[PDB]
Structure formats: C-alpha cells, structure tokens
A paper describes a structure:
The phytase APPA derived from Yersinia intermedia exhibits exceptional overall properties, including a high specific activity (3960 U/mg), excellent pH stability within the range of pH 2.5 to 10.0, and resistance to pepsin and trypsin digestion at 37 °C for 2 h, making it highly suitable for application in the feed industry. By hydrolyzing phytate—a compound that inhibits nutrient absorption found in animal feed—into inorganic phosphoric acid, it effectively reduces phosphorus excretion while enhancing mineral and protein digestion and absorption. However, the issue of heat resistance has emerged as a critical bottleneck hindering the industrial application of phytase due to the technical requirement of instantaneous high temperatures during feed pelletizing processes. The active site within the two domains typically consists of two conserved motifs: RHGXRXP in the N-terminal and HD in the C-terminal, with His and Asp serving as catalytic residues.
Among these variants, a clear increase in residual activity compared to that of APPA was observed for a variant with four mutations (APPA_Y51E/V86D/A323L/M359L, designated as APPAmut4). However, further verification through shaking flask fermentation revealed a progressive increase in expression levels of both APPA and APPAmut4 following induction, with the expression level of APPAmut4 surpassing that of APPA. The APPAmut4 exhibited optimal functionality at 55 °C, maintaining over half of its activity within the temperature range of 35 to 60 °C but becoming nearly inactive above 65 °C. Below 50 °C, the enzyme demonstrated stability; however, it experienced 45% decline in activity after a 2-min incubation and retained less than 10% activity following a 15-min incubation at 65 °C. Its half-life t1/2 value at 65 °C was approximately 3.4 min. Additionally, the T50 value was determined to be around 55.1 °C. The melting temperature, Tm, of the APPAmut4 (58.2 ± 0.9 °C), corresponding to the temperature at which a decrease in catalytic activity is observed, was found to be comparable to that of APPA (58.1 ± 0.9 °C). Therefore, we crystallized APPAmut4 (20 mg/ml) to determine its structural basis for the observed differences compared with the WT, resulting in crystals belonging to the orthorhombic space group P212121. B-factors analysis indicates that the α/β domain demonstrates relatively lower flexibility than the α-domain, particularly in the β-sheet region, suggesting a higher degree of rigidity. The N- and C-terminal regions, along with loop regions (residue 76–86, 119–128, 138–144, 235–246, 348–351, and 392–395), display flexibility which may negatively impact protein stability due to their limited interactions with other residues and disruption of noncovalent connections within complex networks.
Author numbering: 10 to 418
C-alpha cells in the first residue's frame, strides 16, 4: 500500500489512581470508594504494564509497516517526551519498554519536575491566557446553549450516575433534603465554569464535572482490574457508553471547545506537526529530534488529546472503549507516502486498548488481538478513503490555521 514514513503518538498516560478525591466525590455516595495501590494521580504498576503491552503493539505494528527495523532502535529513531508528571514519565518509559524491550531507551521530559511543562500545559504555564468571557461564550457555543441544558441533554446518563452512586442515600442527598431540595443528581448543583483571574485555569464544577470524574474513575477501576467496579452497579457496554458520555461531554466542552483547545493545544499541535514532517527547526519543534526520527511519543493527558481533537475537528467513538481519551490511548499521527506517485498523506488514528484489553491485561499483537485503531476524520482535510487520509500539504495548512499563534512556545 503506502509507506509509513513517520509517526507521532500523542499518548495519554496509562491507568492511574484518581488525582483527587474531593469531599463532594465522597458525599455523593453512601458507599466507600475503593482505594488504589499508588498515590493519587500516579500510574499504577498495572497501568505501566498495560502501557508496555501497548508499546509492544506499537512495536509490532510499526515494524510490520517497516517504519522500525527489527532489533533495537535508538533515541535517533524513537523519541519519547513526557510531561513532568510521574504518570506521564512512567507511561513514556513503559511505552519505550514495550516498543523496544532491552534497548535502554529512556523517556525524556522537562528536567524541572517542579514546574508545569508549557508544551503540555501552555495556559497553566502562562504562555497564553484564556479570557473568561470568550471561554464562557465558546463553551456555550460548543454546547449549543447554557450549561443548564446539560441536565436535559444528559438526563439519562445523569440519572444513571445517580443510581450507580446510590445518590439518593448519600450524605449529599440528605444535605439537599435538609435544604428542602430534591435529590435530582443532574441538578445537585449548578454547572459552573470558572476562569481564574489570571486566565491560566478554567474549571468546571457541578454535576457534569463530577460525573465526568466519577465515570473516569469507574473506568480506571475497571482498567486497573479492580474486583469491585462502581460497587458492582455498572455493567453492560451501553451503560458504560452512556455513563462515560458525561465524561466525554465534559471533555468536549472543557477541552475540545476550539477556543480552549487552541489555547491549550497549540504547542502540542505544533510539536506533533513539526515532528511528523520532521521540520526540526520549525516553530514549535522543541525537542532534539534526530534527522532519523521515525516515532515521536508524547506522554500527555486526556485533556491534551481532546485539545488536539478540538483544534483539528476530530470526533471519534471507540469500539469497546467508552472513554474517548482512554488510559494509554494515543492520538496517532501517521505520515504515509504513496510509493507510486510519492504523494504524502497524514492519517490520524486513535490507538487504544479496549475495556477488556485493559482489564484483562491482554497481550496485544497484530493478528490475534490488536489494539483498537480508529481512523479519525480531520476538519478541512481530504478524509480520503476508509482511513480518512489527509494530503500532507492540506494537513499542514489545517495545522497552521488551527494553531493560536499567541500560544506557541
């Protein structure tokens, strides 16, 4: 077919413990949240193992495509840059361990682990600011109305989440009833967006935000192979899809909303595009990539993937993976060249482990049990053929149009 020339993987970190267990998260259920074997927000050992399995699949796939030779690549061939978080650094390392076992590759990352990496969090870092009014306006435009619409749009998932929590028996519900309120989970509080004064943080609070977090946690519990997921009250693929639709909706609103996405994702989009075509001195190419670079692995977060998706108009649904930005899942950019006419193409795929592949820690390979690999259509691109190929020149213009120039690094 075509020749796979270069790949950039924007990977979410692997399975992690919840980053935060708020009073609200405790109060919305009478049940006890299962504890995790690692500190909050850290990649679990099982998370690492799953990422390594995924790295083995990547290795299998890229070698089958001739992009990697057999044997050990070097940093010249494969570069893994991770965010400063432990979860992303170890995800990058687990990726290298799986794609190149015994090859001594080491994940790279900003040396100062104490500060945000502006590649992964430019807004947090202060590279550019979100305007509160534009942010509220952009999110509502994205939603098609004010956040109060969410309780109607997601009434069934919200009710489902309330049932899974046994919200009606929760301390939060008794507090609501104390105040003469009903225990309508969808409306236990207002959905509020808060941009802090400096414009470096945007927060969603309220039922959607909480439900996004809780749904993700259930999925992480499930992905961790925990024995009790959601107190055994969450089973069935559609129920998983439905419940996680709250999470995906939250990520759509708070990370895919182009205004937000372009401010938070511009350095990553520029890093992805410049690494993909290997324009090593281009703006936004921040890494010491070798001219021989075949794979750039970016160890980031679900928000990063969603920001990129928002910037490029990417929308997907993953068979057997209700989280659109699943643990260890990678937004994979592939540079293809048609040997017959030398036309070059960009393909975007979401590589991911299904729920079962995660939960059962299944060995991934090409013939028996591949990772999921969902082609993703790009706004403004040719989206040609079943794999939604974009002509390279078209992809580069789309990237140039999607970036917020004030947000580059």
């Amino acid at each position: 077919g075509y020749t796979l020339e270069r790949v950039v993987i924007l990977s979410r970190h692997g399975v992690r413990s919840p980053t935060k267990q708020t009073q609200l998260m405790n109060d919305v259920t009478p049940d006890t949240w299962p504890q995790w074997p690692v500190a909050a927000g850290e990649l679990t050992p099982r998370g690492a193992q799953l990422v390594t399995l995924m790295g083995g699949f990547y290795g299998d796939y890229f070698r089958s495509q001739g992009l990697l030779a057999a044997g050990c690549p070097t940093d010249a061939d494969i570069y893994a840059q991770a965010d400063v978080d432990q979860r992303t650094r170890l995800t990058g390392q687990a990726f290298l361990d799986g794609i190149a076992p015994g090859c001594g590759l080491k994940v790279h990352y900003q040396a100062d682990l104490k500060k945000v990496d502006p590649l992964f969090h430019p807004v947090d870092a202060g590279v550019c600011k979100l305007d509160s009014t534009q942010t509220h306006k952009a999110v509502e435009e994205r939603l098609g109305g004010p956040l109060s619409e969410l309780s109607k749009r997601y009434a069934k998932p919200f009710a489902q989440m309330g049932e899974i929590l046994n919200f009606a028996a929760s301390p939060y519900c008794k507090s609501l009833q104390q105040q003469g309120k009903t225990c309508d989970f969808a409306n236990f509080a207002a959905n509020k967006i808060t941009v802090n004064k400096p414009g470096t943080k945007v927060s969603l609070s309220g039922p959607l935000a909480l439900s996004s977090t809780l749904g993700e946690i259930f999925l992480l519990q499930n992905s961790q192979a925990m024995p009790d997921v959601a107190w055994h009250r969450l089973t069935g693929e559609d129920n998983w899809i439905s419940l996680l639709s709250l999470h995906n909706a939250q990520f759509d609103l708070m990370a895919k909303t182009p205004y937000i996405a372009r401010h938070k994702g511009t350095p990553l989009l520029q890093q992805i595009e410049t690494a993909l075509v290997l324009q090593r001195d281009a703006q936004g190419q921040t890494l010491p990539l070798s001219p021989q670079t075949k794979i750039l692995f970016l160890g980031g977060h679900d928000t990063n993937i969603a920001n990129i998706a928002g910037m490029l108009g990417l929308n997907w649904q993953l068979p057997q993976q209700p989280d659109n930005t699943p643990p260890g899942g990678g937004l994979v950019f592939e540079l293809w060249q048609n040997p017959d006419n030398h036309q070059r193409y960009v393909a975007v795929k979401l590589f991911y482990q299904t729920m079962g592949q995660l939960r059962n820690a299944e060995k991934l390979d090409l013939k028996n049990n591949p990772a999921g690999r969902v082609p993703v259509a790009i706004d403004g691109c040719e989206n040609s053929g079943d794999d939604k190929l974009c002509q390279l020149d078209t992809f580069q213009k789309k990237v140039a149009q999607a970036i917020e120039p004030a947000c580059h690094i």
